RNA sequence: GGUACACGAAAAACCUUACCUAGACUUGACAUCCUUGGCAAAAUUAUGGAAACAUAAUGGAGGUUAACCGAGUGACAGGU
RNA sequence: CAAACGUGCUACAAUGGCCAAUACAAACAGUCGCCAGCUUGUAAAAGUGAGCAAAUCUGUAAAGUUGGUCUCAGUUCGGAUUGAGGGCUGCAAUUCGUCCUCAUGAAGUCGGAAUCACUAGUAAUCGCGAAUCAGCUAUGUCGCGGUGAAUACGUUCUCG
Ligand SMILES: [Mg+2]
Ligand SMILES: [Mg+2]
Ligand SMILES: [Mg+2]
Ligand SMILES: [Mg+2]
Ligand SMILES: [Mg+2]
Ligand SMILES: [Mg+2]
Ligand SMILES: [Mg+2]
């Protein structure tokens with residue numbers, strides 16, 4: 001038995017919310033199918049960006065619509081991984097939208 | 105009764121022109137565009 | 153205003169012509185488009201033709217005009233009298 | 239006179255301060271979003287089609 | 299009072315009394331006050347000759363208040379005797395820096411001399 | 422047997438710890454003297470408004486933790502917090518406290534600025550011409 | 551054209567003298583959205599009232615404000631030329647409101663020194679029926695007495 | 706007019722810029738289609754230059770022409 | 786630029802000016818950036834230089850409380866205008882950048898006829914952040930929070 005990686009801090013963030021929740025359920029199921037003690041799926045504050053754009057083409061600055069872009073964020077810290085988990089981590093297939101911030 | 109003159113400018117500003125001529129003759133084409141570098145990626149599953 | 157370390161500023165094209173023109177005795181008004189060049193002490197005694205936007209106005213530099221910018225002693229626009237609207 | 243400014247924008251200038259940001263779809267110079275490189279009225283058309291993931295209308 | 303031809307108010311503190319002089323403002327007055335070591339909050343009427351000599355010497359060391367007026371006058375004459383575009387702009391009683399002159403900048407143009415706006419019978 | 426209450430007002434949390442004691446209440450806010458936490462502009466009474474008309478002789482030592490807001494908003498948070506801790510000691514007190522409406526979240530928060538408007542509800546000056 | 555009657559916010563009992571009316575006048579002298587400042591100014595005037603009149607400040611304040619308080623209100627009603635007025639009995643809530651509004655307006659115009667002493671003099675000056683607020687109340691009352699005839703027709 | 710006037714313009718020193726004065730160019734700064742080759746454009750250093758642009762230089766990633774670099778070439782490109 | 790109008794900012798002040806100490810936010814933004822601390826400088830800033838790809842590091846909260854002073858003056862109000870010396874960005878700040886320091890101290894003591902907005906965290910007010918941006922008298926615009934009111938009897942008149 002070995003570890004080769006103490007304190008694997010996986011970080012997740014994506015523009016969409018529901019897929020992000022789906023990715024957390026899939027990641028957790030595989031890592032508990034192997035022998036690892038997950039600390040917990042904590043939520044992080046969502047970075048929201050807002051852009052204001054005038055609706056009209058030429059005049060009337062007053063009529064301006066709004067748009068938003070939410071950066072939903074999650075955290076995941078792995079205690080001990082071992083080969084049993086890393087090889088199974090290769091078959092995860094994360095839906096494009098979710099972005100991983102693996103920090104080793 | 106007159107204390108000669110204590111004005112005339114020139115002298116003080118003259119050093120400023122001397123500084124400027126030295127800079128212009130020093131001028132080295134150190135054209136560049138940037139600062140911090142590297143640490144630019146989006147990560148993966150470390151091998152997918 | 154303008155920093156110290158930087159100093160003054162000439163485009164250095166004006167500098168090359170002025171050194172050549174000061175050595176040459178039979179000086180004639182110098183045609184410069186550089187309104188950005190500050191008047192340097194060595195410039196004294198020469199005459200320049202600054203581009204006001206339309207023509208080249210002739211300026212005779214003295215021992216006093218040293219320090220300002222070469223375009224400051226020429227105009228760009230002209231206004232001398234309005235006209236009754238009604 | 240649109241294309242030449244568009245073409246000139248792609249070409250590198252001789253001074254760093256000579257570089258401005260133009261819309262990449264049209265050639266409009268003012269009101270360009272550096273976060274997306276797209277002007278306000280192309281961003282509206284593009285946002286109303288779903289090309290930018292996550293740009294939803296805002297209700298606060 | 300007694301400081302040169304200026305008559306600083308007698309019932310007013312000294313650090314404001316120096317401001318009342320033309321060539322000395324407020325910041326330099328504190329500089330004179332601190333350099334001479336004379337303590338503020340001492341009404342000028344309740345002061346002695348010993349302080350009145352130190353302040354006059356340092357005031358004399360700085361630029362005389364009467365000479366600044368001639369200093370401003372020569373600078374305008376120096377700028378106008380140069381033929382500068384800023385000087386011409388200073389010449390016709392207009393903002394010398396970059397202030398706009400379309401609808402504002404009346405502090406240099408005095409009172410308003412209302413003329414007659416154009417006649418619009420409609421088109 | 423301590424009791425805990427969590428009040429809020431203008432985005433300001435509150436952690437009030439109600440401890441039974443018989444040696445004077447000793448009002449305390451965030452480990453500091455009330456006389457030092459507030460501009461003492463007579464705001465101290467407000468929080469005690471439900472603790473006065475009922476009683477303060479039971480000398481409950483209060484351990485308040487408030488993090489956020491200004492000072493009236495923080496004050497608004499703890500008044501609600503004391504009442505929420507008060508709903509665990511003698512549920513009868515609730516009835517009389519309910520009457521005066523001292524057991525309801527104020528629901529009053531600052532509105533969002535709107536585009537084309539100089540504020541939440543302001544609007545630019547209109548011109549007949 | 552509305553058919554709805556507006557609600558009313560609580561007035562709050564005062565925090566010192568337990569006399570509601572103090573909170574209303576505090577809000578009246580409010581400027582710049584300063585709750586603190588207004589309280590300080592007003593409460594400071596009571597300390598001066600103690601120092602000057604040697605009596606209870608709440609008693610002097612009620613005697614001044616209740617006395618300045620008017621009875622008749624003249625409502626403007628134009629038909630063809632100028633306006634013929636109509637005297638009506640004001641409700642009690644509005645009755646108190648004009649007195650406080652009036653007390654502050656004449657306080658911020660006196661030739662006196664810091665408005666602390668200014669407002670203190672106005673309140674002490676209205677307890678003896680000789681001031682600026684009295685004249686205003688007298689003037690509106692005399693207009694109503696003069697205009698007793700048109701009281702029957704209101705609208 | 707209300708429904709224009711801190712409006713287009715969520716940034717006019719040069720650039721932006723569409724304007725004026727000047728110095729320069731003509732299948733053109735950019736594009737396709739056609740006969741035809743690629744053994745470059747850049748960038749930068751010189752001289753003349755207000756800078757455009759010219760005459761000289763390291764002759765340049767590459768991939769054998771992919772993209773582009775061109776010649777020839779008339780349909781045309783182009784117009785804020 | 787002889788002028789006129791619109792929208793805002795600053796004021797004409799002791800509910801204030803100046804000085805000292807000091808408590809309490811939310812949101813947002815950041816690797817050609819945020820820039821902590823330290824050294825120099827009357828200051829804008831410069832040098833050194835960690836930390837932070839960010840619930841971690843950075844972007845001083847101000848009004849507010851207390852103390853001292855001014856004592857109602859065209860002033861310790863008000864800051865325009867003007868002169869000089871500096872700092873930053875940028876090839877380049879004269880036409881035409883802004884900041885700091887020093888100097889001066891216009892008008893203005895509540896504004897005529899007539900008009901505008903607002904029904905609670907609203908009107909009024911105090912700061913903070915972002916967008917476009919090398920830099921910008923944006924006092925503009927878009928957002929976030931701190932304090933926080935008065936009044937609505939009624940549809941006779943007024944506009945739609
Ligand atoms: Mg076009
Ligand atoms: Mg300007
Ligand atoms: Mg219209
Ligand atoms: Mg130009
Ligand atoms: Mg131009
Ligand atoms: Mg080759
Ligand atoms: Mg070949």
Ligand SMILES: [Mg+2]
Nearest residue numbers: 239783784785
């Ligand atoms: Mg056309």
Ligand SMILES: [Mg+2]
Nearest residue numbers: 539793924925
């Ligand atoms: Mg505004």
Ligand SMILES: [Mg+2]
Nearest residue numbers: 799801802854
């Ligand atoms: Mg004070």
Ligand SMILES: [Mg+2]
Nearest residue numbers: 836840841842
């Ligand atoms: Mg920490």
Ligand SMILES: [Mg+2]
Nearest residue numbers: 859892893894
């Ligand atoms: Mg006056």
Ligand SMILES: [Mg+2]
Nearest residue numbers: 802862863864
């Ligand atoms: Mg002032």
Ligand SMILES: [Mg+2]
Nearest residue numbers: 153396878882
């Ligand atoms: Mg300048």
Ligand SMILES: [Mg+2]
Nearest residue numbers: 797798857894
């Ligand atoms: Mg006055």
Ligand SMILES: [Mg+2]
Nearest residue numbers: 542903904907
């Ligand atoms: Mg309403």
Ligand SMILES: [Mg+2]
Nearest residue numbers: 582794909910
């Ligand atoms: Mg205001």
Ligand SMILES: [Zn+2]
Nearest residue numbers: 261264277280
């Ligand atoms: Zn576009």
